[PDB]
Every structure is written in structure tokens, then in C-alpha cells.
Design a protein around this ligand. Structure first.
Ligand code: NDP
Length: 470
């Protein structure tokens, strides 16, 4: 339908076995020195071999790394590639409590490589940051955030970007040869997962047309929490839920009952019959969330979460983004969603819906922070599935009418009518799909623009993008 035509999903398809020769020139491996002990880090360093130059990226100091890298580059001449193992640093940064250290260090590595004039393509490796292949388990949502950042590095610095590669749990010599072969020549691919069966690469496809009933979505009832529920998209979601008979809607935001439009929204929802609670509740404050959940009465237990809290403002190009700007974009996404997961994992929820963005699914220049933050959401929904919990992630394109533009519409990410976007969301929930993008695209505008500087294997599975590029 029209609503079906907004839904896309990510799939992973088999690509060519790589060649057998390792790279001719010298690799530079980047290690986070406090987080260099995971088995897959050892296995990758052993696969790169002992002639690989090693750089320990200590702390988060862009100017000190630029000077260290410039010396390496002077002494070695041109590297074949830079292979980052920084993703193994999952612990939170000591000064930026919503930023995984390896995410901070990956940003600063991309920055310092540019500053020093190292031009060799940067490859960011992860372990468990994607769910690729039937049955695969996304074990690290934190490393999954890195993929959101990496895709935006590829759009802002295409000439010095290699790609992303997720490693299996056991990096055997077949996996190792796949890795070193890809580093020699990746066949134009740049979003790759090495698995036992072969190498897979990431693809965007139209989602299957809706099948009513197929997901056995239970009737909306009980208490439903909508973070960011006082307005834009969260408010429209709340209205849909009230139309569909919710008993009690708990709407939160930092401003709560003081939010713009909040009183009008409460009155409109109440006219439908729904009990409304509005709370001023920072979604990343764990104690406030717990207090809100403790207030729910016996007769209206929590049945669903819709996580719409978030900001996109105060992002910046990769070359300029600060760790304090990245912490502020992460906080309502990573920190808040981690708390929502931890405090509801035992409640047997009917839905746990995380609102992501096209910035995280395909990438948007100028939005590295927002891409990382929303890629963490997508990765958490797949991780939660592996635990047997419900979860979904919905990556929006551009909304019309309400919510958070001119650049994006000009690049062919067109504004959706709210009712069509909401009806596409309902199709995803009735199917019980784990992940989708819901976006109106003009592919004839989007594909040539998005690929002007480097090809995108991601879009090869969208026939409208192939036709635009013909
Ligand atoms: N509009 C669009 O085209 C798209 C939207 N999205 C995503 O959908 C979600 C909703 O966006 P939209 O409605 O358009 O944006 P709005 O700015 O209209 O709504 C976002 C809301 O989140 C609340 N919020 C922000 N930070 C926090 C926080 N730390 N704790 C609790 N609430 C917070 C805001 O209220 P307060 O400031 O009072 O906290 C507001 O209620 C966002 O997560 C966004 O990333 C994704 C793609 C596209």
C-alpha cells in the first residue's frame, strides 16, 4: 500500500569470498590500551601479523594523537589501511557518562587521522555490534553505536574511509583470512559481517507488505509509557494509542506538564476516555524512572514503552564534534534506553519500541552524534530479542506537520504525512517486526546524491535506487 511503501528493512546478503593475499603495504592497528584483552582483539592482532605497526590511543586527546600519528606517518610513509580495535572499549568515559570510551576514541581517531594527514582508509572492527545471518546474536549494543558513526564518516570523509567489519565469536583461521582478504580488497563493500558460513554485507530493502494479524500484537491496554510523549511524534503516538483504547498513558519529558502543547494534548486524550499522567522525568535519570514505575497502580500495570525522547540539535561534522556535544546527543538515547531496558526486563511487556532515525540506518552528513545515538537503539532492540524480550526499533525519515530539515528534503528524504507514518508503524507492530525504517524517499533524487563520492552497496537491493543510477 502507500503505508507499505514507507517501510524498509535491513538485510544481510552473502558477498564474494575475498582473495587469499594479505595487504601488500603496512597496516596500522589502533588499540585502546585498557581494553586490549578481549579474545577477538587478540585474534585480530594475531591475524594482522607482527609487521603491523601498533598505536595505543591513550585517553581522549585529539592534539596528542595527531602529533603521535604524524610521527608514525613520517617514519613509515603511507599505510595501506588503519584498522581500529577501539570498539572493544565499552566502558563509559569518565567525564562523559553517556559516551562509551571506544565511541569517543573512534571519533577522535577519525579527527586526528585527518589532522595528521594519514590518508590510508580507516576500518572500524566490532564484535557483536550487528545481527547478521539467521540466528545471529547482537551481543554488544554499545559497539553497534559505532556503526551509526562509521556510516557518517563514510559520507563526510569518503576518500579516507574503509568501512565497518563485524567479527564472529571465534576468529578462526577462516575468519581471519576473510578479514585480511577484505583489508586487501573489499569488492566496494564497506558494511560487512564475517560469519562461519561466509562474509555478509548490509543491504536496505523494501519490507514485506503488511499481513494483518501475523504478529499477534495484543490489544493496547493497561499503562503505556511514552517518553517524549508531550509533543511532536510522541504526542501523535499517544493520540493513536488513545484512539486504540489505551487505559492509561504516562507521557514524560523534561518539561512535563510545562511542555509546549501539553495541556491541549491532555485535554484531547482525556476526551477519548483515557487516564493521562504527565510527568517531568529526565529519561536518563534512573531514580526518577524507577519512581515513576513504582507509582503505577495494581489495576494499570505497565504493558508497553514507546521511547520518543531525544534531541538532534547541537550535532556537528565529524571533524568538529566535541565529546560534550556527543554526550548530550547520547544521553536520551543510550542512557535512557539502557535504564528503560533494565527496569522493564522482568515485566513481560507487550511492546518496547525505540524511535531511531534514517541518520542511523543509511547515514546523514552532519549528524554523526545523532547517528551513533540512534544506532545504539536499533542494536538494543536486536539484543533484547536475543534475550527473549519484545523489542522493536523504528527509524524515521522526515515527518511533516509535527516534530523536529531542508537539507534532508532536498536530498530526497521527503516529509511524511503523520497518518501514513503512524499507519506504517502500526503495520510493523502488527507484524511484530524487530527493525524497520519508515520513510518517504524520492530515490531519483536520493540515490545520485548519496552516491556522488563513493558507491553504496547498501542501496543495490532497492530497485528504484539501481534504476536512478542507470
Ligand atoms: N520528526 C522527525 O522527522 C524524526 C524524529 N525522529 C525521532 O523521534 C523522536 C521524536 O522526535 P519528535 O517528536 O519529532 O521531536 P520533538 O522535539 O517534538 O520531541 C522529542 C521530545 O523528547 C523530549 N526529550 C528530549 N530530551 C529528553 C530527555 N533527556 N528526557 C525526556 N524527554 C526528553 C522532548 O521534551 P523536553 O525538551 O521537554 O525533554 C520532546 O518531548 C526523537 O527521539 C527523534 O530522535 C527520528 C527521525 C525523524
Amino acid at each position: 500500500s502507500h503505508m507499505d511503501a514507507l517501510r524498509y528493512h535491513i538485510e544481510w546478503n552473502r558477498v564474494a569470498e575475498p582473495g587469499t593475499a594479505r595487504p601488500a603495504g603496512r597496516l596500522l592497528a589502533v588499540i585502546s590500551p585498557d581494553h586490549a584483552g578481549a579474545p577477538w582483539v587478540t585474534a585480530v592482532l594475531d591475524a594482522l601479523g607482527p609487521d603491523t605497526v601498533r598505536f595505543e590511543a591513550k585517553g581522549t586527546d585529539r592534539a596528542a594523537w595527531a602529533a603521535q600519528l604524524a610521527q608514525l606517518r613520517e617514519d613509515e610513509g603511507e599505510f595501506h589501511a588503519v584498522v581500529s580495535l577501539l570498539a572493544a572499549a565499552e566502558a563509559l568515559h569518565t567525564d562523559h557518562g553517556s559516551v562509551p570510551l571506544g565511541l569517543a576514541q573512534t571519533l577522535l581517531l577519525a579527527q586526528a587521522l585527518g589532522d595528521a594527514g594519514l590518508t590510508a582508509p580507516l576500518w572500524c572492527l566490532t564484535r557483536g555490534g550487528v545481527a547478521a545471518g539467521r540466528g545471529d546474536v547482537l551481543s554488544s549494543p554499545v559497539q553497534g553505536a559505532l556503526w551509526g558513526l562509521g556510516r557518517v564518516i563514510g559520507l563526510e570523509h569518503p576518500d579516507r574511509w574503509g568501512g565497518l567489519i563485524d567479527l564472529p565469536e571465534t576468529v578462526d583461521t577462516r575468519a581471519a583470512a576473510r578479514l585480511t582478504g577484505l583489508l586487501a580488497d573489499a569488492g566496494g563493500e564497506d558494511q560487512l559481517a564475517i560469519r562461519g558460513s561466509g562474509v555478509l554485507a548490509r543491504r536496505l530493502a523494501h519490507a514485506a507488505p503488511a499481513v494483518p494479524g501475523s504478529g499477534k500484537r495484543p490489544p493496547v491496554h493497561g499503562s503505556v509509557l511514552v517518553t517524549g510523549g508531550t509533543g511532536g511524534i510522541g504526542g501523535r503516538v499517544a493520540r493513536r494509542l488513545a484512539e486504540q483504547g489505551a487505559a492509561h498513558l504516562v507521557l514524560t519529558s523534561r518539561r512535563g506538564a510545562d511542555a509546549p502543547g501539553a495541556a491541549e494534548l491532555r485535554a484531547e486524550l482525556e476526551q477519548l476516555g483515557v487516564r493521562v499522567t504527565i510527568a517531568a522525568c529526565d529519561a536518563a535519570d534512573r531514580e526518577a524512572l524507577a519512581a515513576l514505575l513504582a507509582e503505577l497502580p495494581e489495576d494499570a500495570p505497565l504493558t508497553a514503552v514507546f521511547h520518543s525522547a531525544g534531541v538532534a540539535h547541537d550535532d556537528a561534522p565529524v571533524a568538529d564534534l566535541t565529546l560534550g556535544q556527543l554526550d548530550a546527543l547520547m544521553r536520551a538515547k543510550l542512557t535512557a534506553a539502557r535504564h528503560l531496558h533494565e527496569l522493564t526486563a522482568d515485566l513481560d511487556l507487550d511492546a518496547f519500541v525505540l524511535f531511531s532515525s534514517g541518520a542511523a540506518v543509511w547515514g546523514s552528513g552532519g549528524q554523526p552524534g545523532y547517528a551513533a545515538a540512534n544506532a545504539y537503539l536499533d542494536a538494543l532492540a536486536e539484543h533484547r530479542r536475543s534475550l527473549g524480550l519484545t523489542a522493536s526499533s523504528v527509524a524515521w525519515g522526515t515527518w511533516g506537520e509535527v516534530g523536529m530539515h531542508d537539507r534532508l528534503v532536498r536530498q530526497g528524504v521527503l516529509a511524511m504525512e503523520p497518518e501514513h507514518a503512524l499507519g506504517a508503524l502500526d503495520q510493523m507492530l502488527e507484524n511484530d517486526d524487530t527493525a524497520a525504517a519508515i520513510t518517504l524517499m524520492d530515490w531519483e533524487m536520493f540515490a545520485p546524491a548519496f552516491t556522488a563520492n563513493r558507491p553504496s552497496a547498501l542501496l543495490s537491493t532497492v530497485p528504484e535506487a539501481v534504476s536512478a543510477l542507470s
